[PDB]
Amino acid sequence: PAWXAXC
Amino acid sequence: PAWXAXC
Amino acid sequence: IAALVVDNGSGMCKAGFAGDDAPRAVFPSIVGRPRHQGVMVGMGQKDSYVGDEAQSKRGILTLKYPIEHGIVTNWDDMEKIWHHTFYNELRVAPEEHPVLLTEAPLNPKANREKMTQIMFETFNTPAMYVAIQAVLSLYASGRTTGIVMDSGDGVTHTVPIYEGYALPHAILRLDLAGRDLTDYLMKILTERGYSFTTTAEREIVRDIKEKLCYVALDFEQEMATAASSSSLEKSYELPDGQVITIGNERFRCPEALFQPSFLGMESCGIHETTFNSIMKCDVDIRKDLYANTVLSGGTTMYPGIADRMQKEITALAPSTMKIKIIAPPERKYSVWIGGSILASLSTFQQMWISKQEYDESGPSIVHRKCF
Amino acid sequence: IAALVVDNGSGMCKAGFAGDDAPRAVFPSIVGRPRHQGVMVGMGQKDSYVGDEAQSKRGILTLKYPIEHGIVTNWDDMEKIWHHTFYNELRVAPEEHPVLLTEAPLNPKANREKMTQIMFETFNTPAMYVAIQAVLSLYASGRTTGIVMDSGDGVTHTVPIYEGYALPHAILRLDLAGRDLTDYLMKILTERGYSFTTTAEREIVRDIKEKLCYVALDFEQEMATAASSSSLEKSYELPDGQVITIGNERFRCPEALFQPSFLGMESCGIHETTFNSIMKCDVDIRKDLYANTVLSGGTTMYPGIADRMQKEITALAPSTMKIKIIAPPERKYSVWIGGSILASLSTFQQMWISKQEYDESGPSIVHRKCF
Amino acid sequence: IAALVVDNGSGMCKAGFAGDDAPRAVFPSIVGRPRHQGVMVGMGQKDSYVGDEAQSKRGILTLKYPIEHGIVTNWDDMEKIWHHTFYNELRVAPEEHPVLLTEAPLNPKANREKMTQIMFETFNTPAMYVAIQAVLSLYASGRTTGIVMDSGDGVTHTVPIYEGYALPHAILRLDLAGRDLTDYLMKILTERGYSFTTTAEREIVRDIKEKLCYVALDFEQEMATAASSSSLEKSYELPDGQVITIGNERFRCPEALFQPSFLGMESCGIHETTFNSIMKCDVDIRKDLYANTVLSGGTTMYPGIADRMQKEITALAPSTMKIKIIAPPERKYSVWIGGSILASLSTFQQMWISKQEYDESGPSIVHRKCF
Ligand SMILES: Nc1ncnc2c1ncn2[C@@H]1O[C@H](COP(=O)(O)OP(=O)(O)O)[C@@H](O)[C@H]1O
Ligand SMILES: Nc1ncnc2c1ncn2[C@@H]1O[C@H](COP(=O)(O)OP(=O)(O)O)[C@@H](O)[C@H]1O
Ligand SMILES: Nc1ncnc2c1ncn2[C@@H]1O[C@H](COP(=O)(O)OP(=O)(O)O)[C@@H](O)[C@H]1O
Ligand SMILES: [Mg+2]
Ligand SMILES: [Mg+2]
Ligand SMILES: [Mg+2]
């Protein structure tokens, strides 16, 4: 969730 | 890591 | 009775009865287990899903590939793949039909031993053979003189085979394969902030590779275009609905087959290993190989890889040669098809090791026929 | 003129001039905003607060960290942080000194580009660089051969850099970090009766985490020690002065560093990512890497972590090999110590990108010597 | 002033002043370039490394041999080997001492010019000579007649030297040598599951070849013993501490010297090329030769190789010719030793091409000799 997709 | 001494 | 043909590929298991023109069973070679405690006991869960089951239930499972670079790393996982191959995917009692096993070149003696032991003693197959995958690849095009460049999820290899006899001393293996290109695809997608870490996420990246990557013909000019216009870049949407843009990365991933330095492998690229195997072949025969470079296995499916292999190996060959890259459709499952072809034949009907032979002579029969 | 070294950590920013052995300023990297209407017009209050001002006003602000997992999730709250870093905490004009920033491995390429634009076009710096956090550390350790496990509030990195020549392909980034363990500490403290929810309570949990918690040398045995005895019970007073008695919780909270399965991440423990990072490197250098394993960043400060690390990699690694977890006191700021050294190491004086270069090559200039 | 003696071997460069009975410098003839980026700029890192520096730095370098099979492949790389020899290995200015270069028989005539031109014009040698390697070997062995079987890393050379002269018509250059032999060890290791690919990894294998491998006096008898009992099995652990377990492989590798078929080589085996050389001689000197079989160069060191060579070549010769194998210790260096003796002769001290002679005649000095 910090990254774009993914986390 | 597959390989016994290498991958 | 019809013999059973099984292509033990590192990423996908292709299998069927002898004489089928295409495999019946085609499934990812995955054994799964649950990542979390089960709480709705009335569901009646099972402890390890396999194949398309594991791929259906993806995000609640850890996903194990039991085969790494042709080496069977986990045997009880692989034994479950074969159990599912036989009783469920093909629906057959493997103790009542002969069995044809594919195997990768330059793969250790113990792998064949344990394959043999499991077939002859877990599954009690009545007769069996283990074929060098490239033999089957060449046979699948109906030709009987050439060099095969096989490139699966786990192994890339070059095998010269002349009048149907292999050249064993002239074989090459390069472990840079489809999984490794999936690995590098992760890393480069991370540049645009698209992180992928879980095995489940790995499978997403595999899917992405399989539909937006392509082999650039001309890397320098391409990458100069990619730094000049957004027109080369496009998009895909996750099982989570959100869109992801694949760009410079599209070509950068598959470029690695020609430049293994990009994954920090000093090993030569696929054009160099093909050349370097042709140049291991006797000076007479090199012409006969250049008209007969056959590609096989699923990572040979990248668009333009034939064009690139040609335009590259062109430079490695002398001028005045018919450098022709044999890249047909069905190269996808070619290895298996070749198995089915060869399995149908009375000459090959001499080759199959009888269970009784192995039973009496122990591993000493296979210790020969592996060469 | 003296350059400035600033580490943009996900939890706390460390900054100062070059040459010094400790970073003068430590504003915990937090921006915070009034949770309610301001009523006393005579107080002279302000829109939002930062660092220790945010900590001072904590019980009435919603707190946001504008860096997560190293990604700068919000650019205006990061730029507020830099405005306070320079003009309030350090009382220096960044448009009169070169500046060195720090950044995580494998962070999205866009982050470096935005940072650069904010430095060159908000703060008008003369020249700039962005060192890869791990790298700086080995400088801080002196040793130029080693593998750095850096673990802070956000990221965790395990770079191996050898003979001073890196090995980028072997880098592994695990997004388990100090924030993640703060968040897990909330869950386990609930089991004995204590509720923590607000952003402000997250900092109280952080205080409990920085004082009473420690790493078990063997989880099962120490677990059993609780189950048998009160001997590991200790207590902490909240701001109310009420004491909260925590136990079985200390050696559980950080056991997550070795078992991320406790927190529903998939990837292996920091010991396993350490061993697996070494195993990516070419087989010669491994002897030297095992003898030069370096810890850095605030989450490496748990008591017992070295003992556990050393035994854990001693299980994974070979017998007839020596394992040296080089973990000094002051491991915490062993980055704005390495950056101090790097800006002092006058051979580096060509590396600072000049504003004139950035004003010609645009954001593309930042990809000079990074991963 | 004393002369400098240099042995331009394929694998290791043996060098030192004349009269000495052991060389003062012995190093692997490797130019090793970076595999990766030198991020820690404070190292003072080198554009390339050589000899023991490259072998220490093995894990981060691409190791290139400048001599392959027996010919120089890249002159500037060889030139670096020479530069390093003088200034670093011996710590001398090459302008200041006479110099001897070893050379192989039937090396094409242009090579002599390139070597000569480099030694006078790059290295300013005050006098120079170039010598047939094999002659030096017998010379060192004292005897004034015999057949040499010299084998290093690149070429196996057989020469019958008679009345102190090489007989050029009888010289059997064989392209099988240490390096080629190294490759085959890689394969037979692969059978048992050990892998090695990088050019760094090649040098690890070289270390194994120089330790565990040996020559069995009769192949299938030994192999039958080894197939029966694990008593013939030994071990040696890599830099990464894991032991390799090895039996059957130990005699199997150097068997190839007697069986070039194992590698698909069309050329005859080591005893064979020796006989095949003997038979070409002036018939009267046949018995003069058979009592005078002389072995040399690093590949000649394997235990049991002399006893095998005797039982082997005894078959090829008509019996009662009294074939005897000269193979004491120190035969690792006979070639360089010979030059050291030759360079001690006062007559030879007259016979060198002087610097003044080359400075008047240029490379044309060789055209009287080369035909
Ligand atoms: N359209 C495609 N483009 C590129 N690669 C593909 C494509 N389809 C499949 N692949 C690759 O083929 C590999 C497996 O091919 P296959 O040989 O059938 O299995 P295995 O390699 O296990 O024998 C996978 O790693 C996958 O990445
Ligand atoms: N004594 C301690 N033991 C364990 N963890 C600690 C201790 N002190 C601080 N920490 C953790 O370290 C985190 C900060 O990491 P640090 O390396 O100092 O900065 P960054 O997170 O920017 O790398 C804090 O969130 C805190 O939870
Ligand atoms: N004790 C040994 N056992 C096995 N091989 C050896 C031994 N000593 C040397 N060699 C081999 O000899 C080769 C080089 O021989 P040498 O004649 O010394 O070098 P060059 O021909 O380059 O001068 C090396 O590749 C090495 O593997
Ligand atoms: Mg396959
Ligand atoms: Mg940090
Ligand atoms: Mg030699």
State the DSSP string of D175-231. Answer: ---HHHHHHHHHHHHHTTT----SHHHHHHHHHHHHHT----SSHHHHHHHHHH-ST
Q: After which residues is chain C broken (C to N over 2.5 A)?
A: none
Query: Number of structural domains, chain D?
Result: 3
Note whether D362 and D311 are same-domain residues: no
- C99-131 per-residue burial string, b: 16 or more CB within 10 A, e: under 16: bbbbbbbbbbeebbeebbebbbeebebbbbbbb
Structure tokens at E275: 């006989």
The DSSP letter of residue E94 is G
- Give the residue whose CA is nearest to atom 5 of ligand 2: D299
Structure tokens at D298: 């605030």
Ramachandran angles phi, psi of C257, nearest 5°: -60, -30
Structure tokens at E180: 């080629």
* CB of D9 closer than 6 angstroms to any ligand 2 atom: yes
Per CB-CB distance under 8 Å, the chain B contacts of C71 are 2-3, 7
Separation in Å, CA D66 to CA D26, D78, D202, D313: 16, 6, 15, 34
Answer whether E366's CB lies under 8 Å from E109's CB. Answer: yes
**Considering CB atoms only, which of D168, D169, D267 is closest to C197?**
D267
Q: Mutate which of D150, D301, D331, D337 to test ligand 2's pocket (most atoms within 8 Å of Cβ)? A: D301
- Separation of alpha carbons C221 and C239, rounded Å: 34
Per CB-CB distance under 8 Å, the chain E contacts of B5 are 193-195, 238, 242, 244
Angle between helices D109-121 and D75-84 (to 10 degrees): 50
* CB of C301 closer than 6 angstroms to any ligand 1 atom: yes
Q: How many residues does chain E have?
A: 371
Note whether E124 and E56 are same-domain residues: yes
Note whether C37 and C61 are same-domain residues: yes
CB contact under 8 A, E42 and D284: no
**Which residues fall within 8 angstroms of residue E32, CB to CB, at 6 or more apart?**
E48, E49, E50, E53, E54, E57, E58, E61, E62, E63, E64
CB contact under 8 A, D369 and E200: no
Q: Is the dihedral of CA D300, D305, D311, D312 positive or negative?
A: negative
Structure tokens at E344: 């001690």
CA D245 to chain centre: 28
DSSP 3-state assignment of D115?
helix
Separation in Å, CA C289 to CA C157, C258, C278, D4: 15, 20, 7, 63
Note whether D258 and D283 are same-domain residues: no
Q: Is the dihedral of CA C49, C51, C53, C54 positive or negative?
A: positive
Per CB-CB distance under 8 Å, the chain C contacts of A5 are 193-195, 238, 240, 242, 244
Instruction: Please give the interface size between C and D, counted as residue pairs whose CB atoms are below 8 Å apart.
Output: 30
Q: Does D245 touch chain C (CB under 8 A)?
A: no
Note whether C101 and C141 are same-domain residues: no
Q: Which of C189, C195, C205 is the best substitution to test chain A (most A C-beta atoms within 10 A)?
A: C195
> Looking at C267, C288, C304, which one is the last position of a domain?
C267
The amino acid that residue D361 corresponds to is S
Work out the end-to-end distance of chain B between its first and last CA atoms, rounded to an integer number of angstroms: 4
Alpha helices by DSSP H, listed for chain E, are 51-56, 75-84, 109-117, 133-140, 178-190, 199-209, 219-228, 249-252, 270-278, 286-290, 305-316, 334-342, 348-351, 355-361, 367-370
Angle between helices D270-280 and D305-316 (to 10 degrees): 50
- Separation of alpha carbons E207 and E363, rounded Å: 40
- Separation of alpha carbons D233 and D230, rounded Å: 6
- Separation of alpha carbons E340 and E273, rounded Å: 28
The amino acid that residue E143 corresponds to is R
The DSSP letter of residue E283 is G
- Give the residue whose CA is nearest to atom 9 of ligand 3: E298
Residue E116 buriedness (CB in 10 A; 0-12 / 13-18 / 19+)? buried
Q: Is the dihedral of CA C262, C267, C270, C275 positive or negative?
A: positive
**Considering CB atoms only, which of D109, D175, D266 is closest to C35?**
D266
Domain extent, residue C182, equals: 176-267
Q: Name the helix (H) or strand (E) containing D328.
A: none
Answer whether D10's CB lies under 8 Å from D69's CB. Answer: yes
| Number of other CB atoms surrounding residue E38 within 10 Å | 17
Note whether E147 and E296 are same-domain residues: yes
- Touching D (3+ Cβ pairs <8 A), the chains are A, C, E
- Separation of alpha carbons E6 and E25, rounded Å: 9
Structure tokens at E80: 């670096």
Structure tokens at D50: 């930062």
- Separation of alpha carbons E290 and E270, rounded Å: 15
> Looking at D220, D239, D267, which one is the last position of a domain?
D267
* CB of D271 closer than 6 angstroms to any ligand 2 atom: no
Per CB-CB distance under 8 Å, the chain C contacts of E193 are 71, 108-110
DSSP 3-state assignment of C180?
helix
Using a CB cutoff of 5 Å, list residues around ligand 4, an ion.
Answer: C 9, 152, 297
CB contact under 8 A, B6 and E244: no
Separation in Å, CA D202 to CA D65, D231, E216: 12, 27, 73
Nearest CA in chain E to D347: E42
CB contact under 8 A, C69 and B4: no
CATH number, domain of C146, equals: 3.30.420.40
**Considering CB atoms only, which of D109, D169, D364 is closest to C191?**
D109
The DSSP letter of residue D319 is S
Q: Mutate which of C299, C330, C333 to test ligand 1's pocket (most atoms within 8 Å of Cβ)? A: C299
Q: Strand C156-162 and strand C172-174: pairing?
A: antiparallel
E352 closest CA partner among E110, E150, E139, E119: E119
Angle between helices E305-316 and E270-278 (to 10 degrees): 50
Note whether C309 and C349 are same-domain residues: no
DSSP 3-state assignment of C100?
strand
CB contact under 8 A, B2 and C108: no
Q: Name the helix (H) or strand (E) containing D17.
A: strand D12-17
Structure tokens at C205: 């990246």
C-alpha distance from E148 to closest chain C C-alpha (Å): 30
Note whether E77 and E109 are same-domain residues: yes
Compute, in angstroms, the gap from residue C153 CA to the centroid of ligand 1.
Answer: 6
* CB of C10 closer than 6 angstroms to any ligand 1 atom: yes
Resolution in A: 3.8
The amino acid that residue C196 corresponds to is F
Separation in Å, CA E30 to CA E43, E175, E263: 22, 20, 25
Separation in Å, CA E242 to CA B1, B5, D147, D216, E232: 13, 8, 20, 29, 20
Which residues sit opposite E71 in a β-bridge? E68
Q: Is the dihedral of CA D69, D72, D76, D81 positive or negative?
A: positive
Answer whether D170's CB lies under 8 Å from E38's CB. Answer: no
* CB of C11 closer than 6 angstroms to any ligand 1 atom: yes
Q: Which of D175, D180, D267 is the best substitution to test chain A (most A C-beta atoms within 10 A)?
A: D175
Q: Does C106 touch chain B (CB under 8 A)?
A: no
Answer whether C246's CB lies under 8 Å from C208's CB. Answer: yes
Task: Flag whether C touches D (3+ CB pairs, 8 A cutoff).
Answer: yes
- Give the residue whose CA is nearest to atom 4 of ligand 2: D302
Q: Mutate which of C136, C153, C337 to test ligand 1's pocket (most atoms within 8 Å of Cβ)? A: C153
- Separation of alpha carbons D120 and D118, rounded Å: 6
- Separation of alpha carbons D75 and D96, rounded Å: 23
CATH number, domain of C239, equals: 3.90.640.10
- Separation of alpha carbons D174 and D277, rounded Å: 11
CA D270 to chain centre: 15
C302 closest CA partner among C258, C260, C339, C267: C258
Give all strands (DSSP E) within C82-151, no chain letters. Answer: 99-103, 127-132, 146-151
- Separation of alpha carbons D104 and D87, rounded Å: 25
User: Which string of DSSP letters, residue by residue, matches D236-298?
Assistant: EE-TTS-EEEE-SSTTTTGGGGT-GGGGT--SPPHHHHHHHHHHHS-TTTHHHHHTTEEEESG
Q: Strand C61-64 and strand C293-296: pairing?
A: unpaired
- Separation of alpha carbons E143 and E140, rounded Å: 8
- Separation of alpha carbons C161 and C144, rounded Å: 7
Note whether D88 and D118 are same-domain residues: yes
Note whether C252 and C293 are same-domain residues: no
Residues with CB under 6 Å of ligand 3 are: E 7, 9-12, 152-154, 178, 206, 209-210, 297-299, 301-302, 332
Q: Does B7 touch chain E (CB under 8 A)?
A: yes
- Separation of alpha carbons D193 and D177, rounded Å: 25
Phi-psi region of E123 (alpha: psi -120 to 50; beta: other; left: phi over 0): alpha
CB contact under 8 A, E190 and C108: yes
Note whether E170 and E306 are same-domain residues: yes
Q: Does A6 touch chain D (CB under 8 A)?
A: no
Token pair 């877990």 is at which residue?
C122
Task: Flag whether E touches A (3+ CB pairs, 8 A cutoff).
Answer: no
CA-angle at C195, arms to C191 and C199, nearest 5°: 135
- Touching C (3+ Cβ pairs <8 A), the chains are A, B, D, E
DSSP 3-state assignment of E80?
helix
Note whether C13 and C98 are same-domain residues: yes
> Looking at E242, E267, E292, which one is the last position of a domain?
E267
| Number of other CB atoms surrounding residue D52 within 10 Å | 14
Which numbered ligand comes closest to the C-alpha of C134? 4
Angle between helices C305-316 and C270-278 (to 10 degrees): 50
The DSSP letter of residue C136 is H
Q: Does B1 touch chain E (CB under 8 A)?
A: no
Ramachandran angles phi, psi of E124, nearest 5°: 55, 35
C-alpha distance from E264 to closest chain C C-alpha (Å): 7
Q: Does D346 touch chain E (CB under 8 A)?
A: no
Q: Name the helix (H) or strand (E) containing D311.
A: helix D305-316
Structure tokens at C181: 């290109």
Work out the end-to-end distance of chain E between its first and last CA atoms, rounded to an integer number of angstroms: 33
- Separation of alpha carbons E214 and E248, rounded Å: 11
Q: Does D233 touch chain A (CB under 8 A)?
A: no
